[PDB]
Amino acid sequence: MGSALFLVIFAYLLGSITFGEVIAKLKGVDLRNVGSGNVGATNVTRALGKKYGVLVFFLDFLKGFIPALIAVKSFGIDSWVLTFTGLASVLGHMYPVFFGFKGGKGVATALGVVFAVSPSVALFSFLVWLGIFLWKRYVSLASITATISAFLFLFVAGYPVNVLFMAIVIGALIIYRHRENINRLLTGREHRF
Ligand SMILES: CCCCCCC/C=C\CCCCCC(=O)OC[C@@H](O)CO
Numbered sequence: 082m083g084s085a086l087f088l089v090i091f092a093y094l095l096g097s098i099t100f101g102e103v104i105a106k107l108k109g110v111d112l113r114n115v116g117s118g119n120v121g122a123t124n125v126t127r128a129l130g131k132k133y134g135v136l137v138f139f140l141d142f143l144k145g146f147i148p149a150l151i152a153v154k155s156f157g158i159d160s161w162v163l164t165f166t167g168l169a170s171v172l173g174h175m176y177p178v179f180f181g182f183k184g185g186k187g188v189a190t191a192l193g194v195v196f197a198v199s200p201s202v203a204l205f206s207f208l209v210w211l212g213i214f215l216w217k218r219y220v221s222l223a224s225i226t227a228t229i230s231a232f233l234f235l236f237v238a239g240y241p242v243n244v245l246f247m248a249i250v251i252g253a254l255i256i257y258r259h260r261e262n263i264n265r266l267l268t269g270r271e272h273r274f
Pocket residue numbers: 082083085086089090093161162165
């Protein structure tokens with residue numbers, strides 16, 4: 082139906098606004114030059130400082146949270162509308178429709194989707210991320226581990242098949258976007274903080 086289609090397209094368009102690009106050009110920085118050349122909060126931090134990375138993290142978080150919250154409240158956590166809305170937000174971050182935006186890895190946006198479903202599951206997944214990051218100082222290893230953990234937490238918390246499907250497909254896409262990070266991790270050559 083039309084309302085579900087509207088929300089899903091809105092989520093994709095909103096997700097396509099990679100805010101790292103918005104703030105990096107705002108002070109003249111070729112984000113694709115600095116650091117790793119990525120648009121996510123991690124390279125924003127590396128290029129502009131921690132304060133700007135946190136702002137980008139929150140903005141990229143909100144473009145997952147806001148459409149998914151609308152889906153939760155308008156259709157239900159058990160609705161496949163939520164499934165496709167959350168996926169659309171993350172796909173927009175990864176494959177932005179706007180010609181001049183390059184995609185990111187979707188981790189902050191995916192956390193926003195999870196938080197709209199269950200703040201508890203999201204906070205536990207973020208604790209996994211933080212613990213892994215403090216342990217080894219690899220952002221990629223923390224994002225991969227916490228992405229898998231979010232699926233396990235949603236499963237043990239009893240969330241339904243449409244949510245688990247959403248989490249498995251989003252998690253597969255996130256891990257695919259980390260394929261070069263994984264090759265570096267396998268040979269001890271990942272960039273360390
Ligand atoms: C390139 C354009 C991006 C968007 C492409 C189209 C998105 C695909 C599907 C949107 C509708 C999903 C409906 C899911 C569903 O069964 O909802 C229950 C009901 O409300 C639908 O009539």
